[PDB]
Amino acid sequence: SDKFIYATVKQSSVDIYFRRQVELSTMYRHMEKHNYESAAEAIQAVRD
Amino acid sequence: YKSFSDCEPDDNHLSIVTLEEAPFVIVEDIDPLTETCVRNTVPCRKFVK
């Protein structure tokens, strides 16, 4: 949903796991919508 | 295509029709970045006019 925004570090192991898993493919549909270069930016965004 | 003159008639290929439904038959377009169907979906032709 637009209000419920979740993300992970772009181009990493979690991305591979989300992409290759078939049933989780819809999850991956959200993934490219919002990604962060590094974990520090992701945790700062979560804190903010 | 019939392989030979004595080949068994095609019976295991069945033409199946359906109708798009919200929880049962969800229809989406082709993936632009791969140009094929998703690994869980199946290909199916719609007669667009």
A23 contacts in chain B (CB < 8 Å): 40
Specify the 3-state DSSP secondary structure of A20: helix
Ramachandran category for residue B35: left, alpha or beta (phi over 0 → left; psi -120 to 50 → alpha):
left
Measured in angstroms, the resolution is 4.1
Give CA–CA dist A7/A15, Å, rounded.
10
Give CA–CA dist B4/A19, Å, rounded.
44
Q: Taking the mean position of all CA atoms in its chain, how far away is CA A14? A: 8
The residue with tokens 């192991």 is A13
Of the candidates A7, A1, A12, the residue with the CA atom closest to the CA atom of residue A28: A7
Query: Which technique was used to obtain these atomic coordinates?
Result: cryo-EM
Residue type, B21: E
- Asked if A7 contacts A42 with a C-beta cutoff of 8 angstroms, the reply is yes
B40 contacts in chain A (CB < 8 Å): 22-23, 25
Torsion of CA B19, B24, B29, B32, to 10 degrees: -160
